[PDB]
């Protein structure tokens, strides 16, 4: 049948072997969730971090939920943040309303090189246009690490993962509705 | 003006609960309130201001008399009738149980000159801690007394010629 | 855009319209080149960056690493693209510590700590002889290994094995001790049957013993004679008695300086001149304000 994960706060969270290529130019995230009711205030579900440099720690990509008000943490929505190993600043993307603590949400976070957009639940919530190019070189590859659930910082997560799918190519909005038509199958 | 609800009870709660009990932090939150009891920050100043003409003793009395103070005003500050005649009498009480536990008739017969010279007229008619202190502090030593009634004609002949002319002897 | 005579504006996008009007142009367009920003860090960790041409586009900027730092690939050149940001680095120096130099008194556990090919956060095991010990401990611990590693600037932290300092001698001959090393290693005391060479061994044991004021007031039974600790205290509580041979008062001493504790004057041989009570000066001691959350001025020291 289908068999999900359930991410507690305790720190339970895992890594993602070497032995897959990370994507460098275009990518896709789908991943069924089911978000618990109170989580922490800068806490991801899936992250492209960095792990052999030291000036910057705060590259690659990572979607998670985080309130916008950082000054009263009122209301929680989805994110996106990306950070190019060109680019000098981070743009966070922001969802239009705030999370179901008991529903499941099909999450999708496009790449493609010029803009980045999020579909939640099916329809695209915000796009935006300033990160432009790949997100780090091919040289420094297999520096580059996946993390699902978690942040090096424990920034952990609490609900259930159901199907993480992640693409080498950017897929568009009719890739996005087959591919939550379709499941896992 | 008889409640401490003109003032909240809750941003005053917040600076007493987020400062610390060793300098007068309590006593900078303390200071403004619906209710005059105006007068322990600046006790808690001018103890600190003077400090270095006591000696040991009596630099040892201040830092348990100031350490109980700051303790018991975070302590008994929890449930209490929100109206200023109770607020002036735990005040009092504290002030008085915490002045007479820690030997203050010791610290005065140490050094008194720097306890009579150090006061002011100024501001200690219209503060009813300094006056707790004032008329606490007699009762130790006569010569205490004697000094402190020669500081207050010294401040009559500086600032108010009422009582020095009329009544200037009792009997 | 530079605009002149104009009424409303629309936001056409890369492109703009321009209208003549009364025999001018109503705009002042330029296509500037994007400008890159100076590249400080972000882009190549650890190296000098010096373009020869500019920040703009179509430039491109040379980079050159430490002397710490390696450099692996065939292009070293960054290129301000199109998108107004430098281009991904195809070489990236390296950060390889070099070789440790020789620390003296010394063993290398690690073999591989003897190459000069070594990545940054390598751990190389020091073990110190025998005699020699790293410091941060006392005569009665010994711990005779420590632990090197690779910093971020390119270099190994310092660290080196000590001689061990042999135990003091008693005061039943002190004063008059004369030492072939000291405080050294394998030092040989013997006074001007028995023990006649004192041999202060690798452990740092003693094999054998040696055999045959107006402010400050000592108090002890036997008097002038030996075996006796006298109490010796200042004539007020408040100040405290200290040992400076070297020459320093009671106002002479800096707020860094750590002056020893009186040490109660054992008669020694002879006369006891080894603790001396003119040497021996009462300054001003601490007072009971420790651990009270106050800082004290007169006792900051």
């Excluded at chain 3, 292009?75 to 281009?87: I, Q, R, V, Y």
Aim: glycine share 8%.
């Amino acid at each position: 049948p289908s068999r999900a994960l359930y991410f507690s706060g305790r720190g339970e969270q895992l890594r993602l072997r070497a032995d897959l290529e990370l994507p460098r130019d275009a990518f896709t995230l789908q991943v069924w969730l089911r978000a618990e009711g109170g989580q922490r205030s800068p806490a991801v579900i899936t992250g492209l971090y960095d792990k052999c440099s030291y000036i910057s720690r705060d590259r690659g990509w990572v979607v998670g939920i985080h309130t916008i008000s950082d000054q009263d943490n009122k209301d929680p929505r989805y994110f996106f943040s990306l950070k190019t190993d060109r680019a000098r600043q981070v743009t966070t993307i922001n969802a239009h309303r705030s999370y179901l603590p008991g529903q499941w949400v099909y999450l999708a976070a496009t790449y493609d090189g010029q803009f980045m957009k999020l579909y939640v639940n099916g329809a695209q919530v915000a796009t935006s246009g300033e990160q432009v190019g790949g997100i780090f070189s091919p040289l420094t590859q297999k520096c580059k690490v996946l993390m699902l659930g978690g942040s090096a910082l424990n920034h952990n997560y609490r609900g259930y993962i159901e199907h993480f799918s992640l693409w080498k190519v950017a897929r568009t909005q009719r890739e996005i509705l087959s591919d939550m038509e379709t499941h896992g199958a | 003006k008889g409640r401490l609800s003109l003032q909240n009870t809750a941003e005053i709660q917040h600076c007493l609960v987020n400062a610390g009990d060793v300098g007068c932090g309590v006593f900078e939150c303390f200071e403004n309130n619906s209710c005059e009891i105006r007068g322990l920050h600046g006790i808690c100043m001018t103890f600190l201001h003077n400090a270095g003409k006591f000696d040991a003793q009596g630099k040892s009395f201040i830092k348990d008399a100031l350490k109980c103070k700051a303790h018991a005003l975070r302590h008994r500050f929890g449930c209490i009738s929100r109206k200023c005649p109770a607020i002036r009498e735990m005040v009092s009480q504290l002030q008085r149980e915490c002045y007479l536990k820690h030997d203050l008739c010791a610290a005065a017969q140490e050094n008194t000159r720097v306890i009579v010279e150090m006061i002011h007229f100024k501001d200690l008619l219209l503060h009813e801690p300094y006056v707790d202190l004032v008329n606490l502090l007699l009762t130790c030593g006569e010569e205490v007394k004697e000094a402190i009634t020669h500081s207050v004609q010294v401040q009559c002949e500086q600032n108010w010629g009422s009582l020095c002319s009329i009544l200037s002897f009792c009997t | 855009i530079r605009r002149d005579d104009e009424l409303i504006k629309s936001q056409t996008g890369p492109s703009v319209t321009v209208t003549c009007t009364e025999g001018k142009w109503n705009k002042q367009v330029a296509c500037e080149p994007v400008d890159c920003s100076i590249p400080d860090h972000h882009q190549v960790y650890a190296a000098s960056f010096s373009c020869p041409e500019g920040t703009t586009f179509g430039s491109q900027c040379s980079f050159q690493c430490r002397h710490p730092a390696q450099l692996k690939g065939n292009n070293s050149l960054l290129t301000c693209m199109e998108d107004g940001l430098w281009s991904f680095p195809e070489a990236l120096c390296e950060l390889m510590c070099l070789a440790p130099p020789p620390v003296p008194n010394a063993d290398l556990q690690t073999a591989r700590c003897r190459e000069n090919k070594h990545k940054v956060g390598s751990f190389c095991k020091y073990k110190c002889k025998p005699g020699y010990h790293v410091p941060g401990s006392s005569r009665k611990s010994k711990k005779r290994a420590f632990k090197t590693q690779c910093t971020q600037d390119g270099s190994w932290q310092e660290g080196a094995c000590v001689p061990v300092t042999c135990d003091p001698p008693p005061p039943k001959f002190h004063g008059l001790y004369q030492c072939t090393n000291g405080f050294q290693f394998n030092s040989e005391c013997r006074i001007k049957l028995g023990s006649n060479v004192i041999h202060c061994r690798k452990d740092g044991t003693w094999n054998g013993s040696f055999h045959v004021n107006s402010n400050l007031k000592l108090q002890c039974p036997d008097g002038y004679a030996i075996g006796s600790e006298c109490a010796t205290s200042c004539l007020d509580h408040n100040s405290e008695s200290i040992i400076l041979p070297m020459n320093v008062t009671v106002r002479d001493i800096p707020h860094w300086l750590n002056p020893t504790r009186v040490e109660r004057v054992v008669c020694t041989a002879g006369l006891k001149w080894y603790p001396h009570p003119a040497l021996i000066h009462c300054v001003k001691g601490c007072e009971p304000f420790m651990g009270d959350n106050y800082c004290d001025a007169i006792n900051n020291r």
